[PDB]
Ligand SMILES: CCN(CC)C(=O)c1ccc(N)cc1
Ligand SMILES: CCN(CC)C(=O)c1ccc(N)cc1
Ligand SMILES: CCN(CC)C(=O)c1ccc(N)cc1
Ligand SMILES: CCN(CC)C(=O)c1ccc(N)cc1
């Protein structure tokens with residue numbers, strides 16, 4: 001991997017592994033989400049920010065401030081097959097004092113064609129109080145010299161899916177998977193549940209017949225609260241719709257506290 | 270990755286990823302086990318066998334025969350840090366008509382030092398009846414031209430840890446993690462639970478204080494039965510001692526054994 005010529009974006013190639021693929025012998029969306037996080041982390045390293053997933057400056061570290069994901073939105077046109085080489089380009093942009101955005105473009109390395117795209121919204125939070133805060137000029141200025149100054153969007157479209165508000169699923173859910181719990185493999189280096197595990201949990205309540213006959217085209221996921229030590233999660237799904245659409249809700253199995261909400265769009269194979 | 274000069278082994282380099290590391294910022298043993306499976310699969314591919322994890326010939330495919338893991342044994346001297354490049358060499362060997370063995374050697378690409386080693390026992394089974402079978406001459410001959418003819422062992426010593434019999438843990442277990450269940454990410458391309466998921470489940474019942482103060486040095490795991498559709502697993506652990514543990518995975522309901530194993534940990 002390397003920063004590009006102008007130093008405002010980062011590119012890295014990956015060869016799809018045997019254990020990274022599903023029943024069609026192509027990469028799962030969780031494998032894609034993991035590669036997006038990996039290239040994001042290598043971009044942060046390439047310019048001197050923290051490499052713990054929080055991409056902080058020394059200024060944020062003394063204030064105990066971190067960046068956290070508020071939303072992930074992925075659209076895949078073609079999942080890469082096992083053994084295929086995928087090239088991913090990523091870049092970041094400030095969105096005033098609200099937060100930051102990281103975008104990605106996925107390409108087939110052999111054809112050069114765009115096979116997927118993704119975008120994410122990040123907010124600044126105190127790591128101890130968990131209180132959100134607006135971005136100060138000092139923090140914004142530190143990041144601005146590492147971002148394009150003119151807008152560069154993976155999702156330029158007028159009223160695109162990545163910015164739509166997601167409603168709260170109402171009981172009874174059509175489908176559910178109960179009592180989901182993380183194991184050590186689901187944790188990151190900071191002992192926090194990896195953001196990709198929540199994508200897996202959302203997908204667990206999609207019936208197997210949909211997965212066997214359809215391909216996931218778009219997923220939008222809001223992150224509202226973390227799954228903490230000893231927490232157990234229920235995954236709820238209701239059909240909202242050759243295309244099938246679903247509304248998703250992850251909540252704590254006991255008191256029903258919301259942890260995530262999302263939507264998925266699937267195309268018939 | 271590529272076959273080596275003599276064509277009887279395969280080498281491949283991997284750069285440790287951000288999501289592949291634990292609290293010490295070094296690769297977990299499940300990341301190591303996944304890389305061992307990946308290099309095994311690329312070796313099978315390089316010589317024309319199936320690439321579904323079963324490494325079959327056309328002869329085995331017409332008979333509905335597959336190779337399955339009976340035991341995995343891994344010894345790690347140093348876990349690679351995030352960003353480090355690790356080189357893994359692998360080869361296989363027939364063990365008469367009982368089955369086959371795959372061995373691996375892990376090295377730090379910069380220093381050339383051996384940082385780990387692993388070995389595994391595989392048996393031939395009919396994929397439908399699940400009945401084990403001895404290896405016929407026809408199948409053995411197909412594999413022999415792809416294996417070293419003189420013994421080459423990652424664990425050469427007579428009576429080493431990789432060959433020891435593992436006892437069955439007796440209730441009550443000292444520690445347990447109950448109701449473990451796979452999700453789609455735990456499945457392979459054939460919709461079977463990945464062998465590495467069982468390593469993760471075994472480790473779940475080790476108390477967090479051991480993991481925080483020790484490093485896993487050796488793991489030996491027997492595979493007795495698969496976790497099938499809608500199965501739920503209990504992970505049981507008892508200290509037998511460095512710290513040593515005895516492990517048992519069994520189905521949550523009737524208590525049917527699926528795996529047994531042992532782990533050896535060194536104080537940090
Ligand atoms: C979205 C979080 N964040 C810091 C703002 C980053 O990942 C980041 C990384 C490299 C870079 N040049 C600029 C930003
Ligand atoms: C509805 C609140 N919310 C997400 C927490 C936002 O408006 C938001 C917008 C841009 C961004 N980079 C980060 C966050
Ligand atoms: C207006 C769309 N939008 C912000 C992108 C949201 O509703 C949103 C709210 C909370 C959250 N964690 C993530 C997203
Ligand atoms: C006991 C299972 N387990 C994962 C190891 C957890 O409950 C757990 C959840 C969140 C977290 N940050 C850390 C740990």
Ligand SMILES: CCN(CC)C(=O)c1ccc(N)cc1
Nearest residue numbers: 312313324336361369391415
């Ligand atoms: C242990 C299963 N098995 C087939 C015997 C293999 O993985 C195998 C792969 C490549 C090779 N040259 C020889 C053997």
Ligand SMILES: CCN(CC)C(=O)c1ccc(N)cc1
Nearest residue numbers: 339364367368369370390391
């Ligand atoms: C005790 C039975 N058993 C394991 C099933 C074996 O003797 C065994 C030995 C070598 C080998 N490649 C495969 C199997």
Ligand SMILES: CCN(CC)C(=O)c1ccc(N)cc1
Nearest residue numbers: 339340432433434435491492
């Ligand atoms: C000491 C002999 N030996 C094989 C090495 C075993 O006890 C053995 C038995 C069953 C199994 N699935 C794996 C291993």
Ligand SMILES: CCN(CC)C(=O)c1ccc(N)cc1
Nearest residue numbers: 451452453460461497498499
């Ligand atoms: C419903 C959860 N789940 C994983 C998708 C399973 O019970 C499962 C277990 C083994 C297997 N081969 C296939 C599936």
